[PDB]
Amino acid sequence: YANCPGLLDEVAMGEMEADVQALVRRAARQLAESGTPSLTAAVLHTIHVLSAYASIGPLTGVFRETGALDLLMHMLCNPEPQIRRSAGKMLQALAAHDAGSRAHVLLSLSQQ
Amino acid sequence: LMVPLGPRLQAYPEELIRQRHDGHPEYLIRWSVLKEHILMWLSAPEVYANCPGLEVAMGEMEADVQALVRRAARQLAESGTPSLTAAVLHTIHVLSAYASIGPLTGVFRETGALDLLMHMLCNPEPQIRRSAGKMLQALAAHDAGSRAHVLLSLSQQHMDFDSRYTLLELFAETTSSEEHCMAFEGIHLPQIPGKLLFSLVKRYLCVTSLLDQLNSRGQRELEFSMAVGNLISELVRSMGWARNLRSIFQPYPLPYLQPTQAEWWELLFFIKKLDLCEQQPIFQNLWGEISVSVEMAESLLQVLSSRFTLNDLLNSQIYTKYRPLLKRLQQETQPFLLLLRTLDAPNKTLLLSVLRVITRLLDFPEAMVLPWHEVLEPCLNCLSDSEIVQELTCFLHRLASMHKDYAVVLCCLGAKEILSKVGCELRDLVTECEKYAQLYSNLTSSILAGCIQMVLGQIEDHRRTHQNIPFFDVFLRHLCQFWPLFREQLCRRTCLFYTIRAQAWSRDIAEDHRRLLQLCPRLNRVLRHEQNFADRFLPDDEAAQAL
């Protein structure tokens, strides 16, 4: 109020969070099925969709709330190199929103 | 697979982008060149020859996009809140993310999203407008044709020249596709005034839309013919350059060396140029593949010439082989060229008469038909006699006080620095708006490059057709008489095309050895077509030998 006062519909946000939860479920289903390149390409498309979902600013609380972190970590341990790079880009896009997600992600990534 | 392009140039493909006389699915692919990157259209057998390697979720995402658009309808209908714009912005983020997927383009177009973009056109929020532009850019990345359609629906809406400039600049920024992306020339392409730019932009949009939609077939023939003709005519006019106009392969008899429709094409184009009242009698007298006699063509040419831009046709080749002063200058724009040349020459009597005449003639607004602008190059480049210099400055000032479009034309001419070097109010005239020269340069260069892309791509596509767009001779000839750089582009294009075809033929022949007996006539036909191309469209025997 003293220095800069001027600087002072989430249903769709939560809906997209739940939809991303279903999408991550389907993506992990494809990851368990990642023995055929068709499902691998579909999983890459799903990961692109997941990143686009991650492009939001304020919904990081839901993004972690859906427990996407562990699924993403498993995806980083997948032998899909291009998909691994894409997931890394998605995590980096996530990083600007919050630091704690990144810290926990890499920290769990270390204990392998 | 590595493609040997040149002594230092090599190439290699990147990915499939799209699909489509074959009547079969096809594929357009980009190719990175290591020594920029090129784009090409191939066919599935040629794909297997050269590029061997390269579901219900689509339905789910389509339902998501449809429902999202339905929600965004209300998200935009309630644009009266600080949260309204932000929710619309989030919706736009989701959309532009979705439309970056190939299949989503048809869904968005089928979703009536043109209505959404239209509601975005009237955006007082510059953030919302630029976000819609970003969405359109993503749509163009998805598919150029859908982007053309959307921008046309935007164009489907005498508006303010400033508003016109705003809309056109937005469209130029948004539609800077990879095709619109092109190499800077580095050589002086002359100034392009504003209204010419707007008209040519409209024509280019028409041409691109028709070309994308190309694939009875006579409809496609007429569409491509009319679009290419109008574009070539407008580009020649705005450039104004129309006022200036043995063995093919060896360095026994050659079977290919031993062996008009385009005239009818010009005739039909001009008959289409005639209005309904004008064109109807000629069409009735005629009553796309009309067979005629030379006398019939002469009669049609006379009938066309007998009624009424006309001087532009008078400067053509088909005419060879087969307040009153303002209207007069309209009938003969070459008289305007003569006036400009007369001013384009010492003594003070001639130049004084020229200056006084221009001043006393501009007083009548009837100059709207005349361009009155082509001279502006030397009026600032050359002029420095005291009275003469004052007269030139006052003439520029009068032009500035007349038209803000002509003011922008002088702004591109950079009259600010010169009038600062000077008898100075013209500098203040130039100090009206200095934030449009980048727009002028960008739009002009991009449009010229786009036209060159169109012609080169058409020739490449015809290479498989082996069978005439109006005035195409004029454009390629003017570009033929720059030519080093564009010639480099042409030879690179031909090299890639023919390498792909040759590898395809070799792969086919490897299957069965009986193929060569049928192979020989194929080479005959190909070499014949190349010889025809070289004979019709290439002056320098050295150029033909290089090709």
UniProtKB/Swiss-Prot annotation, chain B:
ATP binds at residues 543-547. It is found in: Cytoplasm. Neddylated. Neddylation is mediated by E1 enzyme UBA3-NAE1 complex and E2 enzyme UBE2F. Structural rearrangment of the C-terminal TRIAD/RBR supradomain may play a role in neddylation and deneddylation. Ubiquitously expressed in all tissues with highest expression in testis brain and kidney. The C-terminal TRIAD/RBR supradomain is essential for ubiquitination activity. The IBR domain is required for interaction with UBCH7 and UBCH8. Core component of a Cul9-RING ubiquitin-protein ligase complex composed of CUL9 and RBX1. The CUL9-RBX1 complex mediates ubiquitination and subsequent degradation of BIRC5 and is required to maintain microtubule dynamics and genome integrity. Acts downstream of the 3M complex, which inhibits the ubiquitination of BIRC5. The CUL9-RBX1 complex also mediates mono-ubiquitination of p53/TP53. Acts as a cytoplasmic anchor protein in p53/TP53-associated protein complex. Regulates the subcellular localization of p53/TP53 and its subsequent function. Component of the Cul9-RING complex consisting of CUL9 and RBX1; the CUL9-RBX1 complex is a heterododecamer composed of six CUL9 and six RBX1 protomers. Interacts (via C-terminal TRIAD/RBR supradomain) with E2 ubiquitin-conjugating enzyme UBE2L3. Interacts with CUL7; the interaction with the CUL7 component of the 3M complex leads to inhibition of CUL9 activity. The CUL7-CUL9 heterodimer seems to interact specifically with TP53, likely via the CPH domain. Forms a complex with p53/TP53 in the cytoplasm of unstressed cells. Interacts with UBCH7 and UBCH8. Belongs to the cullin family. This is Cullin-9. The lineage of its organism: Eukaryota, Metazoa, Chordata, Craniata, Vertebrata. The chain holds residues 10 to 1367 of 2517 of the full protein.
